[PDB]
Amino acid sequence: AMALEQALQAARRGDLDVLRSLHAAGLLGPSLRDSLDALPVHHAARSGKLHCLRYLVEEVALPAVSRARNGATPAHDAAATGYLSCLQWLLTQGGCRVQEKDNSGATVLHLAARFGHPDVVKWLLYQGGANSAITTDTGALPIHYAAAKGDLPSLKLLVGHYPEGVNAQTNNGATPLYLACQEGHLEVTKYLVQECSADPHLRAQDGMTPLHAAAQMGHNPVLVWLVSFADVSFSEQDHDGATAMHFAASRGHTKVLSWLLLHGAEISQDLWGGTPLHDAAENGELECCQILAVNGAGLDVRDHDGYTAADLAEFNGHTHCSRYLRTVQTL
């Protein structure tokens, strides 16, 4: 266990002399792995220590294509961490193939996009030969990852390289735009809608629109822009009848909730009879309860189980919300 910690630490630090000493003592080998099955080659590559990576592959003979528990090679580590020098060496001298996949089906191009490394994305596309049309086992393209990260330079590169990806949906139905809205990336959202003809009406498999995702995750700047400039309705419902307001109230996003109410969004029941006040009360979101109650939410509306919002707060132990709601009802 001591040789292991010394080897991994030296590989991350670039301490080539320690690796040489361990190699001389016969203490480096392909079974010397951490708890995720990563070798010293992974730890050098994820740390940008190219001289140690080369020593471990060229001299110690640790395989450049070795795989961690999830199938990641040292090239996957390097692409995810942005260490282009290590990635380039592995893909040329090291013998890694640019299309090698981890267990999920992700390539180094997916991972460079996922973690927002546009220098790596650019080199992979225009020198490394990486394929931009490859889906993982969830249906994800590199463009999905770039959009979710909010990496506009990588996204521009990937749209130019594979423009058919713009409106592609993952297996659960998400478009790059859905993901950009979910993650609150306004400039990427604008680019997709304004410059790439991204369709903001393509829904995920559960009926959620990109606007629902922005409200669910509290990204008011994205929600405001979609409603105000992209012709997205804040009244649309998912497969359960939920509106943007339900999602915002359920997760305490008072700014989204306020903006929706300010601009005339209605306080409506979903297919289960719950209003956004039910969602806020059930989850102990006191400030959302107050905003809804002051702006005309029906305090006495019962869901399909016959429960008012105050009842739901009480059954979930949210006594601050139930006490507030029951006193307001008396007025």
Partner: peptide
Amino acid sequence: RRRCQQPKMLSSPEDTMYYNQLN
């Protein structure tokens, strides 16, 4: 219910754990 709905993810949690522990 609604609050427990997770965002749409592109990879498995085990995958995210691994790539997050590279830094």
